[PDB]
Amino acid sequence: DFVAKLQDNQRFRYNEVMQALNMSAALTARKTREFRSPPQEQINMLLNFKDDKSECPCPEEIRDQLLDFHEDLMTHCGIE
Amino acid sequence: XXXXXXXXXXXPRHRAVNLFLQGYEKSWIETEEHYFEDKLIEDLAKPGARVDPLHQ
């Protein structure tokens, strides 16, 4: 379910940023991640929130559900 | 001089879930999430009743 909610959201943010183009000098830096950066480091960099803030994309809703599931895993294990 | 300088200057579906679980096990679980290295040895030395368990 997490990947189902993440992949479509990534594709949606890519399509939205492509319709609202606003061609500039930073759009290429933003869109190099889509072509370059194979899926391994792509998922590595789009899945990082343990500090206060990183370069996490717009789907912030799934971050909270991932935190809840991680706490559920911790309490299923011996971690208090 | 400025003119000279200017002249000089002019001259698909399950790969995503597999990679997700890989990244999760790589950077989400082993991130220092437990503290047992003192309680374990502390209760492992109590001879509640010889030789202690830690001594064994």
Q: How far is the C-alpha of B28 from the C-alpha of A56, rounded, in Å?
A: 15
Q: Structure tokens of A62?
A: 């799934």
**What single-letter amino acid sits at B44?**
L
SS3 A13: helix
| Resolution, Å (one decimal) | 3.8
Contacts of B22 in chain A (CB under 8 A): 40, 43
Q: Which tokens belong to B52?
A: 């202690």
The residue among A19, A18, A66, A74 whose CA lies nearest residue A46 is A66
Hey, what are A21's tokens? 């183009």
Q: Which residue of A has its CA nearest to B23?
A: A44
Which whole-number Å values give the CA distances from B15 to A34, A44, A51, in the listed order? Answer: 16, 14, 27
Using CA atoms, how far residue A20 sits from A7, A44, A67, in Å, is: 20, 26, 32
Distance, in Å, from the CA atom of A65 to the CA atom of A1, rounded to the nearest integer, reads: 11
Mutation choice for A interface testing from B13, B19, B29, B30 by most A CBs within 10 A: B19
Say how far apart CA B28 and CA A1 lie, in whole Å: 18
Q: Count CB-CB contacts under 10 A for residue A13.
A: 13
Angle at B30 between CA A1 and CA A80, to 5 degrees: 85
Is B27's CB within 8 Å of A3's CB?
no
Could you tell me how many CB contacts below 8 A there are between chain A and chain B?
Answer: 35
